[PDB]
Design a protein around this ligand. Structure first.
Ligand SMILES: *[C@@H]1O[C@H](CO)[C@@H](O)[C@H](O)[C@H]1NC(C)=O
Ligand SMILES: *[C@@H]1O[C@H](CO)[C@@H](O)[C@H](O)[C@H]1NC(C)=O
Ligand SMILES: *[C@@H]1O[C@H](CO)[C@@H](O)[C@H](O)[C@H]1NC(C)=O
Ligand SMILES: *[C@@H]1O[C@H](CO)[C@@H](O)[C@H](O)[C@H]1NC(C)=O
Ligand SMILES: *[C@@H]1O[C@H](CO)[C@@H](O)[C@H](O)[C@H]1NC(C)=O
Lengths: 172, 90
């Protein structure tokens, strides 16, 4: 077991729409002798050396895998970032969960596009409905939560469904 | 140990071994199989430690094979990746 650094996303969504803001933060110890950070994008070292890596407006090139490292923490596992372009996007912090983990999904709309009467669906069957767009929570994840997920709502009178994404729940 | 998924990995291990070392081993059977899941938030992955029997010039010999299987998702497209990382006799 190595003291692996960890990259986490603020906000937590690993699937984002173009122009969204994303800040990547490295969870790792920083010694006073060497307080720099090594960031990697698609396995390649990048120039930024700060503990945080800011993406003001995300573009498709910002997509890919990210890793970080510090003097006291070893190379982290990769974190995946997907930049989507479309009217509607189902968001999640990851697609692999363990039993009892919380599952927090969000139905995100293109910039300046209100959305209402939102439904989260699992394997084609609806799971939760909201008249006003709200997030979907599952505090305790179970093996039955695995499946293909997508959200659909109303842009006024236009009924729209987001692209699907597969979630998997593993043993705890 | 004696399932189809195990055998395919063992045959894959033998096919890859012969390819890189330019050898001619003939798979026979799997005799022991140990699995070690290594998932993350963004991959369903397992490391397989397989002991198999293969014919080396007609003579049966036992080999230990380390096979890495990785499943990732991009948008909604799944990608399966298999890799032989170690192949040694006993
Ligand atoms: C930590 O930084 C020092 C220099 O301040 C360097 O000599 C050392 O190799 C670094 N440790 C690691 C694990 O990179
Ligand atoms: C990192 O170290 C340098 C040189 O010692 C110092 O100038 C800088 O303020 C330090 N940064 C932090 C965040 O402590
Ligand atoms: C990183 O890899 C992803 C995966 O296809 C790609 O979409 C993205 O453009 C890549 N970024 C760079 C800077 O190479
Ligand atoms: C939207 O369309 C789906 C079928 O495409 C339908 O089941 C649903 O009732 C419609 N309205 C809402 C608010 O989902
Ligand atoms: C997503 O999971 C469902 C399980 O009901 C499966 O039928 C479907 O093939 C999966 N999709 C992909 C792309 O693996």
């Amino acid at each position: 077991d190595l003291p692996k650094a960890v990259v986490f996303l603020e906000p937590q969504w690993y699937r984002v729409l173009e122009k969204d803001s994303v800040t990547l933060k490295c969870q790792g110890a920083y010694s006073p002798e060497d307080n720099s950070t090594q960031w990697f994008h698609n396995e390649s070292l990048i120039s930024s050396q700060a503990s945080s890596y800011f993406i003001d407006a995300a573009t498709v090139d910002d997509s890919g895998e990210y890793r970080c490292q510090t003097n006291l923490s070893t190379l982290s596992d990769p974190v995946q970032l997907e930049v989507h372009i479309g009217w509607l996007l189902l968001q999640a912090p990851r697609w692999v969960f363990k039993e009892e983990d919380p599952i927090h999904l969000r139905c995100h709309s293109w910039k300046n596009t209100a959305l209402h009467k939102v439904t989260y669906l699992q394997n084609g069957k609806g799971r939760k409905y909201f008249h006003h767009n709200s997030d979907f929570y599952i505090p305790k994840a179970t093996l039955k939560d695995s499946g293909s997920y997508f959200c659909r709502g109303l842009f006024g009178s236009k009924n729209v469904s987001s692209e699907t994404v597969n979630i998997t729940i593993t043993q705890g | 140990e004696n399932s189809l998924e195990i055998e395919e990995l063992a045959r894959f291990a033998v096919d890859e071994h012969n390819k890189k070392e330019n050898a001619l081993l003939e798979f026979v059977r799997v005799v022991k199989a140990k699995e070690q899941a290594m998932n993350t938030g963004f991959t369903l992955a397992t490391m397989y430690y397989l002991t198999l029997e293969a014919k080396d010039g007609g003579k049966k010999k036992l080999y230990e094979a380390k096979v890495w299987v990785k499943n990732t998702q991009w948008h909604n497209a799944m990608t399966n990746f298999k890799e032989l990382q170690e192949f040694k006799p006993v």
